[PDB]
RNA sequence: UGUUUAUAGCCCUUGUUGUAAUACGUCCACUGGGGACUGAGGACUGCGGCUUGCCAAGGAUGCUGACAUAAUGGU
RNA sequence: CUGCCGAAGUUUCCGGAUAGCAGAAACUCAGAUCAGUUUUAUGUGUAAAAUGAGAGUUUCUAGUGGGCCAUUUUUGGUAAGCAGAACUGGCGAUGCGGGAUGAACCGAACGUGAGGUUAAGGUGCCGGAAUGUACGCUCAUCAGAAAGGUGUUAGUUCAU
RNA sequence: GCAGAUCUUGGUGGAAGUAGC
RNA sequence: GCGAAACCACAGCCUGGGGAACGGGCCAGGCAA
RNA sequence: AUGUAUAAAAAUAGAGGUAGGCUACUCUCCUGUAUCGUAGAAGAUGGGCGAUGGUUGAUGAAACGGAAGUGUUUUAUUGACUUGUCCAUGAAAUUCCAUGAAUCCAUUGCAUACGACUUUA
């Protein structure tokens, strides 16, 4: 299934694997928005990736994730230039996308790709000492949004419980249960 | 080894909860919270028994299991009887003045080999120094002792000739 | 944990020619292989890889290296059937299997029942 | 797709040697043609019998007599390294003798980067006694307390909506 | 506006090509729900179409359609090879192609 | 722990139905569908089968439509 | 302007005459001879079976009448490399697929087209094609695509 | 029967409104 | 206000590698307004 | 464009819910092929029945939503619709696919390759 707008949560996702699936999707004429890019993960411990950046200048993981894709797409080709603008990488979950579903990519999930006991690095933690100086405010927004979202979930859960009780109380439900519904 | 297990006996502490990989060991001395998320080791709690299980772990993981068991044992001992360390000051000509502030949380050292600059060392949480320092965390006491020794250090001075300084005399259990 | 590799544990095949069928592990071969058999005669006693299998909560007691006849006797004795099906997990699988077999006409009946189902909306 | 092929061969009879001796050995080959070629090379190494000097009399594949019963197999192999002279002996637990053989070839090809030509299968035997088992890993697989969670779970339908549970 | 859509959405990926040589006679189409070569057999023979609009009003309308036909599958991920009456423009990469259900074999 | 079918049984050996079945390998002048690209040739022969006629046998013919009073086309 | 054939690129004696390659003609034969052929066998050569192809002459006439690379063979070498002769192919008269790109490497040698399938090489993205399956090994804090190591991985052997 | 010959003849640009007067 | 001559295949960001220079064109790149 | 439909967090090596007084519980996971919506001449005419509810449109604003709040509800009333259960007509020969301020300006020296700059006007 593909949509005109797709929101992908970057928490617990490998950078390269996430970059690959979005690179193909972007060439497919699809708009993809990436949120919480600061919580991306890269195989290899913290010092190695720190040395990698020291050899390498954009401090935003949203820019870094965009930069990784930029060299992973035909940038010279005008088609690649057009597809670049269809990708929107932002840190955290902004209000224009907080009230929308956030899907995940199985091919990039750390739990499905990383062996237990393997060291890994977090981009937001990595970027904190390279020029980024907004971790507190970015974090502060995260708990504020999730607290509001959790309250929304509780209201939705209560509504789901009420309708579920109403659904079971409905005699119509088991009239034609032979269809598996 | 596909499966390896290490068994330990829980002390008479009130709480031996290890939920969310955090050991909230609450005993008669006090309640101490420890984090063990560094090593992914399976834990089994059954009454007064705590079992550390490693499922096909590597040698480094196997080594950390023994280290985690020692850490758990040390935490249990501290929460039951506590850890007390005693240090004896050594001076040759100019005595070193030691001042305790905030119930021993702050230690000021003056006239250390004649030095006119006072060194202030902040004790670790849960450890009180009166020099004998007592606390429920052995690691906190050890780190504080190292900091005190580091503060009372002679720079560009003969170690064999000038024996002035602070050294830990003994360390044991409070109870 | 709740699922561990033990002799007698019932497993469900998720990938292969016997997808959706249940089986019981009889012996452990290696860290990646196991020999299993099923009460259904259509499933022959074959060794399967741990990747193509899933672990279920229900566990049954069987001797090591039990024969197929004894396992079937053991399965009937312990009533393994209708025990896994009692769990809601099997119920979802039964519903999904039936739903995939629904025809076009039955879909319209599903639509009519669903519309009548939403007619309650009373709390 | 290895399969254990038995090969029997003898030298060409002549007035000097009217009755040739029968030489039979069991080797694992993916097909009959590979088995016959390997047999000639083995005989040249040992008995120095050329292909023209001899001829194969019977080729036959051997199935596992009890393929449904788990067993332990010990193989003696001589392997060619930088020195060109090495010997090893390994044990594996599997339900098929071919399955044990192909398992060792993968292990040899990984640990020592071993080629099919370099490897020569010296000895094959069945391990049955508990005290006969020597390797530690198979020893851990022998005690009746074998119980552990499934390792390497990780279980195109891209863009899964929910987070995977990845538990029981 | 629930209804309509007697077809299945599909995306026009690219042309049949080597690493550097492209043959634009046939184009790769990725149909939704198709994820294996054995599955793409069902869509072999269907009539695919490219629908686009233009400023000029021709016959009183504003829609131009380039018909086509699925021919063979392309790889193990459900892609198909579709030949059109007019070869698709190279600009329509990553667009929408409507795979209607005729000629039906079911 | 040690123990020998018990208040689980297993394994091995025969015995064991049998000509078990499956799998593998190979053949069918066995058969049933899906899809694509081609129509070169221009009476008659020939070679075959069915039974003079007929046919899938020495290369495409039918049924239809719409467009034409634009579609297909070219620059 | 198109079509067909198309070398030689060097022996050998000695600026040349030869030759050779390519042609052009005239001849006689396929029941006749042959082959950068392979066998059989007699003593590597020679002689007599298969596999193929029709084979042999005479005349007269254009062009060439360099090399580079690679393989090998040797001799010495000579700091060490290497050099020196050869040996045989390929390019040179030859485009295309691959090798990131790149004249020597891997494939394959070319009328204009349609379909089909491949070779070498590839299937994460750029990039056409599985983020295939099974099994291990690799942790690098410069990976990866002589040795030392409180470096591991599997371990082997010997001691208790 | 032309694309070349620092080709012959004629024409015409950039340089350039430049060097400048 | 009056007004040349010289020159001119065509151009003009580099980074590297591209085996024969290759940078002035090729591929990887960034740049490119 | 063709349903242009969908909001928890968080573990994943245990999480969530469920319930009891953080301590003892239980249940679900093992995805979305899920769920919601999708019935009518693009959805007709009326007759009802049945809800007497639901679906919404129209406006009258209330709060929430700083971030990029610009959208989430709450509704107040009204307008319709209602295939929720049903009927009776109706919808076609296209009789096989193609669809007003500010700048220059004056002032200005606080400037000064030249603009700029600089107040005033």
UniProtKB/Swiss-Prot annotation, chain A:
GO terms for cellular component: cytosol; cytosolic large ribosomal subunit; preribosome; ribosome. Keywords: Cytoplasm, Phosphoprotein, Ribonucleoprotein, Ribosomal protein. It is found in: Cytoplasm. It comes from the Eukaryota. GO terms for molecular function: mRNA binding; structural constituent of ribosome. The keyword Ribonucleoprotein applies. The modification Phosphoserine is found at residue 177. GO terms for biological process: cytoplasmic translation; negative regulation of translation. The keyword Metal-binding does not apply. InterPro entries: Ribosomal_uL13, Ribosomal_uL13_CS, Ribosomal_uL13_euk/arc, Ribosomal_uL13_sf. Its main location: cytoplasm. Belongs to the universal ribosomal protein uL13 family. Component of the ribosome, a large ribonucleoprotein complex responsible for the synthesis of proteins in the cell. The small ribosomal subunit (SSU) binds messenger RNAs (mRNAs) and translates the encoded message by selecting cognate aminoacyl-transfer RNA (tRNA) molecules. The large subunit (LSU) contains the ribosomal catalytic site termed the peptidyl transferase center (PTC), which catalyzes the formation of peptide bonds, thereby polymerizing the amino acids delivered by tRNAs into a polypeptide chain. There are 3 genes for uL13 in S.pombe. NCBIfam families: L13_A_E. This is Large ribosomal subunit protein uL13B. The gene is rpl1601.
From Swiss-Prot, chain B:
It is found in: Cytoplasm; Nucleus. This is Large ribosomal subunit protein uL6A. Signal peptide: none annotated. It comes from Schizosaccharomyces pombe (strain 972 / ATCC 24843). Belongs to the universal ribosomal protein uL6 family. Component of the ribosome, a large ribonucleoprotein complex responsible for the synthesis of proteins in the cell. The small ribosomal subunit (SSU) binds messenger RNAs (mRNAs) and translates the encoded message by selecting cognate aminoacyl-transfer RNA (tRNA) molecules. The large subunit (LSU) contains the ribosomal catalytic site termed the peptidyl transferase center (PTC), which catalyzes the formation of peptide bonds, thereby polymerizing the amino acids delivered by tRNAs into a polypeptide chain. GO terms for molecular function: rRNA binding; structural constituent of ribosome. GO terms for cellular component: cytosol; cytosolic large ribosomal subunit; nucleus; preribosome. Its main location: cytoplasm. Keywords: Cytoplasm, Nucleus, Ribonucleoprotein, Ribosomal protein. PROSITE patterns: RIBOSOMAL_L6_2. GO terms for biological process: cytoplasmic translation. There are 2 genes for uL6 in S.pombe. The lineage of its organism: Eukaryota, Fungi, Dikarya, Ascomycota, Taphrinomycotina.
From Swiss-Prot, chain C:
It is found in: Cytoplasm; Nucleus. GO terms for cellular component: cytosol; cytosolic large ribosomal subunit; nucleus; preribosome. InterPro entries: KOW, Rib_uL2_dom2, Ribosomal_eL14, Ribosomal_eL14_dom, Translation_prot_SH3-like_sf. It holds the Pfam family Ribosomal_L14e. Keywords: Cytoplasm, Nucleus, Ribonucleoprotein, Ribosomal protein. One of its GO terms (molecular function) is structural constituent of ribosome. Gene3D superfamilies: 2.30.30.30, 6.10.250.2270. This is Large ribosomal subunit protein eL14. It comes from Schizosaccharomyces pombe (strain 972 / ATCC 24843). The gene is rpl14.
Curated annotation (Swiss-Prot), chain D:
SUPFAM superfamilies: RplX-like. Coiled coil: none annotated. GO terms for cellular component: cytosol; cytosolic large ribosomal subunit; preribosome. It comes from the Eukaryota. One of its GO terms (biological process) is cytoplasmic translation. It is found in: Cytoplasm. Keywords: Cytoplasm, Ribonucleoprotein, Ribosomal protein. Component of the large ribosomal subunit (LSU). Mature yeast ribosomes consist of a small (40S) and a large (60S) subunit. The 40S small subunit contains 1 molecule of ribosomal RNA (18S rRNA) and at least 33 different proteins. The large 60S subunit contains 3 rRNA molecules (25S, 5.8S and 5S rRNA) and at least 46 different proteins. eL20 forms multiple interactions with RNA and proteins in the central protuberance, connecting components of core functional centers that are located far apart. There are 2 genes for eL20 in S.pombe. Component of the ribosome, a large ribonucleoprotein complex responsible for the synthesis of proteins in the cell. The small ribosomal subunit (SSU) binds messenger RNAs (mRNAs) and translates the encoded message by selecting cognate aminoacyl-transfer RNA (tRNA) molecules. The large subunit (LSU) contains the ribosomal catalytic site termed the peptidyl transferase center (PTC), which catalyzes the formation of peptide bonds, thereby polymerizing the amino acids delivered by tRNAs into a polypeptide chain. This is Large ribosomal subunit protein eL20A.
């Amino acid at each position: 299934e593909f949509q005109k707008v797709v929101v992908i949560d970057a928490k617990g996702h490998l950078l390269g694997r996430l970059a690959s699936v979005v690179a193909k999707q972007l060439l497919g004429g699809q708009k993809v928005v990436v949120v919480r890019c600061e919580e991306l993960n890269i195989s290899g411990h913290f010092f190695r990736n720190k040395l990698k950046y020291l050899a390498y200048h954009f401090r935003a993981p949203s820019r870094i994730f965009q930069k990784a894709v930029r060299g992973m797409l035909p940038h010279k080709t005008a088609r690649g230039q057009a597809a670049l603008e269809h990708l929107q990488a932002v840190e955290g979950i902004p209000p224009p996308f907080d009230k929308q579903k956030r899907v995940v990519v199985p091919a990039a999930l750390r739990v499905l790709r990383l062996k237990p006991g393997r060291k890994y690095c977090t981009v937001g933690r990595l970027s904190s000492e390279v020029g980024w100086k907004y971790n507190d405010i970015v974090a502060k927004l995260e708990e504020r949004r999730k607290v509001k979202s959790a309250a929304f979930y509780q209201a939705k859960l209560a509504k789901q419980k009420k309708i579920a009780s109403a659904k079971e109380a409905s005699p119509v439900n088991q009239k034609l249960s032979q269809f598996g519904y | 080894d596909i499966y390896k297990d290490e068994t330990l006996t829980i002390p008479k502490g009130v709480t031996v909860d290890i939920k969310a990989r955090n050991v909230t060991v609450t005993g008669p001395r006090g309640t101490l919270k420890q984090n063990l998320r560094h090593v992914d080791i399976e834990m089994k709690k059954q009454g007064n028994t705590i079992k550390f299980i490693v499922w096909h772990g590597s040698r480094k993981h196997n080594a950390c299991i023994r280290s985690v068991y020692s850490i758990i044992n040390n935490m249990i001992i501290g929460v039951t009887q506590g850890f007390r360390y005693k240090m004896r000051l050594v001076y040759a000509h100019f005595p070193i003045n030691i001042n305790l502030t905030e119930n021993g949380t702050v230690v000021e050292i003056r006239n250390f080999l004649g030095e006119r600059i006072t060194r202030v060392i902040k004790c670790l949480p849960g450890v009180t120094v009166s020099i004998i320092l007592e606390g429920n965390s052995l690691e906190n006491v050890s780190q504080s002792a190292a900091n005190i020794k580091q503060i009372c250090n002679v720079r560009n001075k003969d170690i064999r000739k000038f024996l002035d300084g602070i050294y830990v005399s003994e360390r044991g259990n409070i109870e | 944990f709740k699922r561990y590799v033990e002799v007698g544990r019932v497993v469900l095949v998720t990938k292969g020619e016997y997808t959706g069928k249940l089986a019981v592990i009889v012996d452990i071969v290696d860290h990646k292989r196991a020999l299993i058999d099923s009460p259904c005669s259509e499933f022959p006693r074959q060794v399967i890889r741990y990747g193509s299998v899933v672990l279920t909560h229900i566990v049954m007691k069987l001797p090591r290296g039990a024969r197929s006849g004894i396992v079937a006797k053991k399965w009937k004795a312990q009533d393994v059937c209708n025990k896994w099906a009692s769990s809601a997990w099997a119920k979802k699988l039964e519903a999904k299997k039936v739903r995939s077999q629904l025809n076009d006409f039955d879909r319209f009946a599903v639509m009519r029942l669903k519309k009548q189902r939403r007619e309650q909306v009373n709390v | 797709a290895l399969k254990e092929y038995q090969v029997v061969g003898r030298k060409v009879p002549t007035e000097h040697e009217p009755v040739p001796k029968l030489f039979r050995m069991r080797l694992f080959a993916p097909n009959e043609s590979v088995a016959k070629s390997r047999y000639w090379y083995f005989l040249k190494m040992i008995n120095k019998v050329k292909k023209a000097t001899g001829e194969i009399v019977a080729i036959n594949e051997i199935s596992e007599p009890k393929p449904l019963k788990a067993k332990v197999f010990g193989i003696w192999i001589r392997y060619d390294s930088r020195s060109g002279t090495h010997n090893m002996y390994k044990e594996f637990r599997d339900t098929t003798r071919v399955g044990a053989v192909e398992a060792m070839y993968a292990d040899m090809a990984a640990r020592h980067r071993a080629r099919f030509r370099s490897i020569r299968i010296l000895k094959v035997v069945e391990v049955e006694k508990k005290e006969d088992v020597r390797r530690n890993y198979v020893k851990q697989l022998l005690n009746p307390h074998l119980k552990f969670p499934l390792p390497h779970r990780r279980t195109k339908k891209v863009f899964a909506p929910h987070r995977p549970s990845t538990f029981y | 506006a629930q209804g309509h859509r007697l077809y299945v959405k599909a995306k026009h990926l690219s042309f049949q090509r080597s690493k550097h040589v492209i043959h634009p006679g046939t184009s790769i189409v990725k149909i939704e729900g198709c994820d294996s070569k054995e599955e793409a057999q069902f869509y072999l023979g269907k009539r695919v179409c490219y629908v686009y609009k233009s400023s000029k009003a021709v016959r009183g309308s504003k829609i131009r359609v380039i018909w086509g036909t699925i021919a063979r599958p392309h790889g193990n991920s459900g892609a198909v090879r579709a030949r059109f009456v007019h070869n698709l423009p190279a600009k329509t990469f990553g667009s929408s192609l409507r795979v209607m259900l005729y000629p039906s074999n079911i």
